[PDB]
Design a protein around this ligand. Structure first.
Ligand SMILES: *[C@@H]1O[C@H](CO)[C@@H](O)[C@H](O)[C@H]1NC(C)=O
Ligand SMILES: *[C@@H]1O[C@H](CO)[C@@H](O)[C@H](O)[C@H]1NC(C)=O
Ligand SMILES: *[C@@H]1O[C@H](CO)[C@@H](O)[C@H](O)[C@H]1NC(C)=O
Ligand SMILES: *[C@@H]1O[C@H](CO)[C@@H](O)[C@H](O)[C@H]1NC(C)=O
Ligand SMILES: *[C@@H]1O[C@H](CO)[C@@H](O)[C@H](O)[C@H]1NC(C)=O
Ligand SMILES: *[C@@H]1O[C@H](CO)[C@@H](O)[C@H](O)[C@H]1NC(C)=O
Ligand SMILES: *[C@@H]1O[C@H](CO)[C@@H](O)[C@H](O)[C@H]1NC(C)=O
Lengths: 109, 242, 200, 117, 109, 117
């Protein structure tokens, strides 16, 4: 009953970065309500993706996602130097909601 | 074959689509369909068929499918989530590889955003990765979009070149499968189907003076009593069996 | 006894002339069109069928020449007054093509009759050629070709060769019932228009 | 659509922490809309604490169910969360955020840092 | 980065002998394109085996081959007095192609 | 499938050797097919010199890369290899052969013997 993520991801600006989040339980059920957040130190967490692949307003079209089985992925296309943040996944379980461990993104240059 | 960054499409129409001829190209590596059965291909008649061809690495073949992401799927060749058709790929090392590496096959590495399904980008315009204009000067945070594969004979599985063909299968249809047929039996008593005209009875020689554009005839009760054989163009007189 | 789109008997047929000015209007296409012409010098070469009648929507272009007939379905940038040069001066460019068909030519004065129908996506042509206003007498037209064009037609135009004189006639088909008589060889020898008069 | 937070930043061991969230631009009495609390201790991921719905239905994290109580006052657009028996290890930034189904939390506030000592 | 072969091979006629060729580098990669030649002095070199074990046309079924790791072997069964020739191996490397030292075959009698 | 070789048999020191290979029975301008040269000095094994591909990609032995140039004429079915700065030690029989992937070289010609003196 824990959402599992990679510790970190990296690549050069202009390249594609993939951040994965996988369930380790069946408690997630349909697992069709996966959210992704972008957290900058000193700032409130921002919603980037919801309901697996939808964007909120005020969000760049460089951000998109999808699901396969019980694993979700966040895709960051055209990586920018401004994308350095801690990314988190979140989903529902039978009696609670969970957040992922958090993946640290680094931009190379 | 075209490079993946610049995949080549041609339209298929007004033909008989024999799908057995493409199973004698190479041993067998990757083959998958979608919305269609491999064994119903020589039957279903399509409104439009498109063939998209390109060369990629073996490990990239898995990206050419609905729901996939990575590099090729996003920046070079994207398929829709509702794609209908069949994908064929095989190992082409023996033709495409070179001792020092075949550098004539390119793919896009640097791209601002993901492509739409069946979208292409043939541009080689300099990509700005940083927050400053380089004005064409390939220095820091400034890149040429494309990279080469450099395919070699010494490469193992997954690094060797593969030729990929995607057949997109889509109103009046023009791309139909082949039809089977048997021998014609005269002066006996058979069941029969002549180019769609089904019936039963005895087929005999006819003396009916059909016009050049007529395929079958009828009696005074508007019931078929003669057909033209679609292969020999002979007229067969149809009567009930004794 | 059959019900189909036929040219009503003893109806009004529009008579156009070709010369020194020729008639080359854009005419409507309704349920179907009956086209006939009388000429000696082969001035009428082809037809245009479509809707926007320009490089805005796809259109069916049928043009005959000395060796074959060329049929194309494309988005054509048609001329304001398209013609053949006795070279092609019908359109400036074909930007998007979907269908093409080639066969032997479709074409005392020479009388040629054509029937153009567009049913369920199929554009079909019937015709006959005999030696010779319109003449009296009766003859049925045989089929030429039924093409899977798949387009709408609302208007059409006749393509003339410029460099003689000719004339052509245009009528329209209606969903009437006719009584057709087939002789011993299956040739239609006579017909009755069941809505012409109380005797018929 | 904003949410502001206020309350104690320093709490003594075994005492009770009370945080008040004040929101504006929306109502919490509408269907499908609630308000919840999340915390983030240093070096750790976001942790769910409590959630109150428009109908006064109150739900809590299973591990803190016995320690948290959440109430609301719809006349002032305020939500109050109290956490009893504060431990020295309970040092984290607390956040107030709007709760919905298709998207779990959004419009997160800046958060308030609470240290127990 | 040198293909290594024995100086010579020998045995009785009618019997089977083996000519070996071993790679000494990883530059060969898959080492799956090994060719064997039979060179008769005064004449052109002839291809006997290609792609490790396949025969060309115009080649006796007495000739075959195999691979184990990064070493290839040429097997000559039913040895004839007519098989006296200098045998060579060849394979690809990272930027070029190499030939082996050459093995001299002698038929006893 | 046949390949014939012709050219100088005697070359002076520091001069350039030019050999021409004329082929028939096949076209070089096809995928997967090239033409290359190999030499065999007395008492030694076969040495790779140069390879030209159907698309005019030119490759050379790393030790002779600066000394060899290879070109082709597809109109006469001929391939020409030139080797500059010939040394007294560059005595060998040169061979023209077809190059493919599953088979590095085949259809070897009889070869031409070149001596430097
Ligand atoms: C390609 O050539 C081979 C050999 O003649 C043939 O068997 C195969 O059917 C051809 N491919 C197609 C699609 O016809
Ligand atoms: C092909 O069909 C034509 C009829 O259009 C027929 O005359 C001809 O004999 C057929 N060919 C074969 C091999 O059956
Ligand atoms: C059109 O046909 C009618 C008969 O239905 C006739 O009376 C009328 O004069 C014709 N019009 C012309 C211009 O001939
Ligand atoms: C008729 O048109 C076809 C196709 O455009 C062309 O090949 C042919 O030469 C033309 N015939 C003449 C006499 O120009
Ligand atoms: C060409 O016409 C076809 C319909 O026949 C249409 O589907 C296609 O998108 C058109 N292509 C262009 C470039 O307009
Ligand atoms: C023809 O017109 C009908 C509307 O009456 C429209 O639904 C149909 O799509 C049109 N077909 C073409 C090929 O434009
Ligand atoms: C049918 O054709 C024959 C010629 O073959 C002709 O003599 C006969 O009169 C025709 N029958 C009729 C009713 O026209």
């Amino acid at each position: 009953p824990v959402l599992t993520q990679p510790a970190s991801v990296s690549g050069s600006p202009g390249q594609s970065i993939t951040i994965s989040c996988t369930a380790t339980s069946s408690d997630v059920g349909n697992y069709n309500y996966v959210s992704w957040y972008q957290h900058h130190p000193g700032k409130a967490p921002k919603l980037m993706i919801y309901e697996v692949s939808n964007r909120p307003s005020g969000v760049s079209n460089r951000f998109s996602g999808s699901k396969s089985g019980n694993t979700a992925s966040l895709t960051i296309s055209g990586l920018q130097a401004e994308d350095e943040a801690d990314y988190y996944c979140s989903s529902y379980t039978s009696s609670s909601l969970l957040f992922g461990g958090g993946t640290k993104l680094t931009v190379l240059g | 074959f075209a490079s993946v960054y610049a995949w080549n499409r041609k339209r298929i129409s007004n033909c008989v689509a024999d799908y057995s001829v493409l199973y004698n190209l190479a041993p067998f590596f990757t083959f998958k369909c979608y919305g269609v059965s491999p064994t119903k291909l020589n039957d279903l008649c399509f409104t439009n068929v498109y063939a998209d061809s390109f060369v990629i690495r073996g490990d990239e073949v898995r990206q050419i499918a609905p729901g996939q992401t990575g590099n090729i799927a996003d920046y070079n060749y994207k398929l829709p989530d509702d794609f209908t058709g069949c994908v064929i790929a095989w190992n082409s090392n023996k033709l495409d590889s070179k001792v020092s590496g075949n550098y004539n096959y390119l793919y896009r590495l640097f791209r601002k955003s993901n492509l739409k399904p069946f979208e292409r980008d043939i541009s080689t315009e300099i990509y700005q990765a940083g927050n400053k204009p380089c004005n064409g000067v390939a220095g820091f945070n400034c890149y040429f979009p494309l990279r080469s594969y450099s395919f070699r004979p010494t490469y193992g599985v997954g690094h060797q070149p593969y030729r990929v063909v995607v057949l997109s299968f889509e109103a009046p249809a023009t791309v139909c499968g082949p039809k089977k047929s048997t021998n014609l039996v005269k002066n006996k008593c058979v069941n029969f189907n002549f180019n769609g005209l089904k019936g039963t009875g005895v087929l005999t020689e006819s003396n009916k003076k059909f016009l050049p554009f007529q395929q079958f005839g009828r009696d005074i009760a508007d019931t078929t009593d003669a057909v033209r054989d679609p292969q020999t163009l002979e007229i067969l007189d149809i009567t009930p069996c004794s | 006894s059959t019900q189909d789109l036929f040219l009503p008997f003893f109806s009004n047929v529009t008579w156009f002339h070709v010369i020194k000015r020729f008639d080359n209007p854009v005419l409507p296409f309704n349920d179907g069109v009956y086209f006939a012409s009388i000429e000696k010098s082969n001035i009428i070469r082809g037809w245009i069928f479509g809707t926007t009648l320009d490089s805005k929507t796809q259109s069916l272009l049928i043009v005959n020449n000395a060796t074959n007939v060329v049929i194309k379905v494309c988005e054509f940038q048609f001329c304001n007054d398209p013609f053949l040069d006795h070279e092609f001066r019908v359109y400036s460019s074909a930007n998007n093509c979907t269908f093409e068909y080639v066969s032997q030519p479709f074409l005392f004065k020479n009388l040629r009759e054509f029937v153009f129908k567009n049913i369920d996506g199929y554009f079909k042509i019937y015709s006959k050629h005999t030696p010779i206003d319109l003449p009296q007498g009766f003859s049925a037209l045989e089929p030429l070709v039924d093409l899977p064009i798949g387009i709408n037609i609302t208007r059409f135009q006749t393509l003339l060769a410029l460099h003689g004189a000719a004339a052509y006639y245009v009528g329209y088909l209606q969903p009437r019932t006719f009584l057709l008589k087939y002789n011993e060889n299956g040739t239609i020898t006579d017909a009755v228009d069941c809505a012409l008069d109380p005797l018929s | 659509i904003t949410l502001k937070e206020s309350g104690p930043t320093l709490v003594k061991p075994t005492q009770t922490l009370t945080l008040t969230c004040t929101f504006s631009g929306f109502s919490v009495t509408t269907s499908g809309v609630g308000v919840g609390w999340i915390r983030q201790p240093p070096g750790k991921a976001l942790e769910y604490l409590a959630l109150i719905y428009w109908d006064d239905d109150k739900r809590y994290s299973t591990s803190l169910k016995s320690r948290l109580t959440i109430t609301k006052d719809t006349s002032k657009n305020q939500v109050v969360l109290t956490m009893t028996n504060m431990d020295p290890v309970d040092t984290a930034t607390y956040y107030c955020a709007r709760h919905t189904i298709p998207s779990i939390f959004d419009y997160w506030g800046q958060g308030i840092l609470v240290t127990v000592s």
